[PDB]
């Protein structure tokens with residue numbers, strides 16, 4: 001199975017570990033088998049117990065109030081692991097999301113191993129940069145390059161972004 005994944009967070013750090021002190025607020029993952037979307041996805045919004053930084057809010061528009069009644073990462077971790085285990089994770093700038101995932105997994109104090117020990121990790125941004133050296137390779141740039149619709153992406157969304165990346169990646173490898 002190939003799982004195309006994306007996450008939205010409360011923000012990120014420009015110095016040191018990018019995830020330190022921040023939290024995942026949305027996880028969006030799409031399943032692809034034999035180069036075909038199966039339709040069986042994973043999508044959750046999470047309660048961070050901290051505020052979303054202004055910069056981050058300017059990107060996804062997810063309000064603090066909307067997350068108050070959501071599950072915590074700890075409450076979705078088991079099913080999340082059951083969903084991704086053994087698959088090839090396809091993520092645009094993989095180190096970003098994997099960093100947050102391993103960070104959140106570590107806070108659970110359950111001795112959960114690193115994601116890349118039970119999942120194969122493919123950085124689709126590295127793949128794109130290799131195929132299109134010297135060109136723009138943001139997800140939006142790739143959407144234009146492969147004629148994928150991102151008109152509903154004024155504000156980024158984890159599932160929205162994962163779905164778009166799935167289409168882009170299938171075309172890139174098609």
Ligand SMILES: Cc1cn([C@H]2C[C@H](O)[C@@H](COP(=O)(O)O)O2)c(=O)[nH]c1=O
Nearest residue numbers: 006007008009011012055056059060156
């Ligand atoms: C693009 C961008 C993302 N981020 C963080 C917070 C977002 O929820 C997360 C999602 O990035 P994404 O929409 O590119 O997948 O990255 C920032 O802090 N500042 C930015 O300028």
Ligand SMILES: [Mn+2]
Nearest residue numbers: 006007092161
């Ligand atoms: Mn992303």
Ligand SMILES: [Mn+2]
Nearest residue numbers: 006156157161
């Ligand atoms: Mn996103």
